[PDB]
């Protein structure tokens, strides 16, 4: 895990560090159920705002391919039905 | 301990003492053992100190 390149990223920006206090309990000591449904809630919300945030310009676009196909999906039709190929 | 006398001890025990309440029990609680960890990180120090008990 030493001579690897985020170990040496790690040693030249951060510093010694200093300070730090991390408590940790056995897994036999937490419920799986735990923060089951608060966290399953709430992770839903956020993905439900995120992705109609970033889905709009795709619908947009869709949209607009959408009437095109339709034009042309009609137009063919036309030029189908009336021995015009 | 050392060179007392039980007799006078007893006395002065009994003179002093003798009037404090016989108040509740010790409580009788149930401590519950978590296994786990507690981990400080220094870097800067010249040895490190690891316990480990059960
Ligand atoms: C038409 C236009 C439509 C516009 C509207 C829709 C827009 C959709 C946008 C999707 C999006 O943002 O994706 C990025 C989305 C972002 O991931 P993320 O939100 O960080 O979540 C990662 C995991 O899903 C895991 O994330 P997690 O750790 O959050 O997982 C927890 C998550 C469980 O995961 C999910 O529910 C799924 C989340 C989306 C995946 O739990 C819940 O969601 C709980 C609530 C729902 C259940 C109750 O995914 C990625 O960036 C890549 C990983 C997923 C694969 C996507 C593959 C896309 C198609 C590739 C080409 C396939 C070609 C096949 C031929």
Redesign the interface.
């Known amino acids: 895990e030493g001579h690897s390149a985020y170990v040496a990223l790690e040693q030249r920006v951060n510093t010694?560090?200093?300070?730090?206090?991390?408590?940790?309990?056995?897994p036999?000591?937490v419920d799986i159920r735990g923060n089951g449904f608060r966290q399953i809630y709430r992770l839903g919300m956020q993905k439900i705002r995120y992705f109609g945030l970033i889905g709009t310009p795709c619908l947009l676009v869709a949209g607009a391919y959408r009437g095109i196909w339709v034009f042309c999906e009609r137009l063919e039709d036309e030029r189908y039905w009336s021995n015009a190929l | 301990s050392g060179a007392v006398d039980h007799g006078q001890l007893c006395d002065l025990a009994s003179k002093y003492f003798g009037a404090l309440p016989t108040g509740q029990p010790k409580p009788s609680g149930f401590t519950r053992f978590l296994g786990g960890d507690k981990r400080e990180t220094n870097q800067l120090n010249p040895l490190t100190h690891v316990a480990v008990a059960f």
């Open positions: 010694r560090q200093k300070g730090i206090i991390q408590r940790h309990l056995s036999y000591d």
